[PDB]
Design a binder for this molecule. Sequence first.
Ligand SMILES: [Ca+2]
Ligand SMILES: [Cl-]
Length: 496
Amino acid sequence: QYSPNTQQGRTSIVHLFEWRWVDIALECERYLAPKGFGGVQVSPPNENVAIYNPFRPWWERYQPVSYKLCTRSGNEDEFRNMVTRCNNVGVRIYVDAVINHMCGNAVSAGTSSTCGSYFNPGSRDFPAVPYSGWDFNDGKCKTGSGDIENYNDATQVRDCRLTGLLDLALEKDYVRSKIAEYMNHLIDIGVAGFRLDASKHMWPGDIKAILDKLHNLNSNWFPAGSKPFIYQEVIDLGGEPIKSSDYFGNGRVTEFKYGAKLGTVIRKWNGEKMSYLKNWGEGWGFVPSDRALVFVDNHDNQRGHGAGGASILTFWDARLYKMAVGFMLAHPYGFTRVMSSYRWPRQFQNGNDVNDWVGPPNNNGVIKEVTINPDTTCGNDWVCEHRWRQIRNMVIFRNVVDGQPFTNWYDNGSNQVAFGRGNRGFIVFNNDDWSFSLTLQTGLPAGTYCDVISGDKINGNCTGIKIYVSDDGKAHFSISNSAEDPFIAIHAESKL
Ligand SMILES: [Ca+2]
Ligand SMILES: [Cl-]
């Protein structure tokens, strides 16, 4: 459950948030495979409520109606085609499994669903599963509202409705079995693992009982006895009774402290400074590295109201964001997930974005295709952060340095820092309001290296900055605080 099941030497996943299956299939073939990406987190592939007020928000996909593989991203045939095509080029698929709940209890009954299945939230009737009132936690929840009211009570957090979402009775073998039926359908299709949505809202032992029903991965693509990768979405920023360590027997956990603190450090909030990152990892109160799924932002919190609130860095903060993502991808802590987003008309009123509900780019509710521009960026309002040179090249950096120790740390006591990954890579950051210019020990073999942030190694030359490492392992680095990207990264495969 802890191993990602990526190909050896592929070390990240990318969240292709709200992408259609056909576009992901193409992306696997044309980009993710050649550029060394390990896999893709897909949006929930099961049927959800079609919500028209507001118009088709992203969050409708976190309100299940059934386990039919029938969504705005595509149908079952399209989903299977994507998984096959991606696996055939060695890029894995991880499913966002929405298994704590069905839809909101106040959603109107009918067939306003992505596959047209009937459902009746008021009567607890989801006949396409099927679930009935016997399958929800109405009777078990002890709060006066039936919803979660107080996160200091670990029981209600699990047994009551998260903001009114009908809460499945996950102690029941029937319910566990319907969820496992869905998940095993997906495993047998070829998926490599799962994000378990809303894991804080499930008992560790109920998750374990579901996981005990899961198959090993499809043996046409994976070695015998391969377990699905499991990463549990548990928001644990401290100060609540529920700790993500309670979930370690099931799989990895999302470490939301990671992006929250990296954001405060890079924004220099409350006197924080990059020099403090020397002991990044468990020293900052994080989970063990071998249980962490790390990320700068996720699909929730990039809208500003998630775990981390306002500190979270996103594509909107492109310059600082690239730096944060770069630090993450260079540092050995955790298994890394890169976000890939769409643009929306973000409109702040009184410090909050009133358009944070807006769904993916669409024509009358039909999600737009991802178009690829000649410069390799995307059109149709897809941001495609994973195609930004500075991010894609750091995904590659992480592959190149895989397994190498954190070493050769330098800092100036402020925001100019550097470190290496054994003898395979070195990275240098300047987040101070003045220039960096210093000779540093890099740990690398002598030679000329292309900076993969400002450029690329192409046809035996560098298109950007070149760094010259001497016989002693030392190299001079110069980074103005006015640089487009105030960080430089070099590695064994960027050597000329
Ligand atoms: Ca629950
Ligand atoms: Cl997440």
